[model samples]
Target: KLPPGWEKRMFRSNGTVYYFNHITNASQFERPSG
Candidate 1:
């Protein structure tokens, strides 16, 4: 279960779908750097 007001973001790249969440207290999305 996710916390209140938190949501998952879907990212598509290279024919793949990825889900991620925001890092607490930071301004960025948790995704792989390529």
Candidate 2:
């Protein structure tokens, strides 16, 4: 999801993919410090 009526392809491959609209500060996906 992007701005109003806007979007883009973050990931496109033959393996795996992940997407989100928002990311938390305490998210483990951020890094090891999470």
Candidate 3:
């Protein structure tokens, strides 16, 4: 279990979760080359 109020802040809503494709695109894959 999460500690106290942390759960309220850290937990994602069912609809707010990232889609698989969005997750892939948003991750280190998107890191821009300098």
Candidate 4:
């Protein structure tokens, strides 16, 4: 699963998955890399 307070979203329109860091109120075009 994703990190705590972190969320992700995916859509067919762009075929991309973006991540959201709730704690920072920010978003990234790529998911967090482990």
Candidate 5:
């Protein structure tokens, strides 16, 4: 279940599942360079 006005971003890396938020731009992984 997701909250109103909120969205989820999902990614897969090395057979692992990662997730993030669309509102705050959260991430479970590190991004190289801005």
Candidate 6:
């Protein structure tokens, strides 16, 4: 499962998948640690 406050999203324009962290207000290409 993904981390809390984090979501799996795609760019849509280019279809690039990434992880979004609401707590950090940032995006990354790897899974996050709690």
lDDT of 3 by residue, 1-34 (tens): 2122221112256533221223233322221321
Which of 2 and 6 is ahead in TM-score? 6
Highest TM-score, which number?
6
Each model's backbone clash number: 0, 0, 0, 0, 0, 0
> Each prediction's Cα RMSD?
7.8, 10.6, 14.3, 3.7, 9.3, 3.6
Candidate 2: segments with Cα more than 4 A from true spot: 4-15, 23-34
- What is the C-alpha lDDT profile of model 6 across 1-34, one tens digit per residue? 5568787768887998888988778788776652
The lDDT for every candidate, in the order shown, is: 0.40, 0.28, 0.25, 0.71, 0.44, 0.75
Q: Which whole-number lDDT from 0 to 100 does residue 31 have in model 3?
A: 19
For candidate 3, the TM-score is 0.16
Per-residue lDDT over 1-34 for candidate 1, one digit per residue giving the tens place of the 0 to 100 score: 4433334454456554433445552222443442
Q: For each candidate, give its TM-score against the true structure.
A: 0.23, 0.17, 0.16, 0.46, 0.31, 0.59
Q: Which model scores highest in lDDT? A: 6
lDDT string for model 2 (1-34, tens) is 2223222223456543333323331212222211
Query: Predictions ranked by lDDT, top down?
Result: 6, 4, 5, 1, 2, 3
Model 6 misplacement above 4 A? 1-3
Instruction: Give the per-residue lDDT digits (tens) of candidate 5, residues 1-34.
Output: 3333344344446564444556666554422221
> Which scores better on TM-score, 5 or 6?
6
User: Lowest-scoring 10 consecutive residues by lDDT in candidate 4?
Assistant: 1-10
For residues 1-34, could you state the per-residue lDDT of candidate 4 as single tens digits?
Answer: 5467667767687797878888878777766752
What is the lDDT for 25 in model 5?
68
* Candidate 2 clashes between residue pairs 3 or more apart in a chain or in different chains: none
Report how far residue 2 has shifted in candidate 1, in Å. Answer: 4.1
lDDT, candidate 4, at 12 = 81
- Model 1 global lDDT (CA atoms, 0 to 1): 0.40
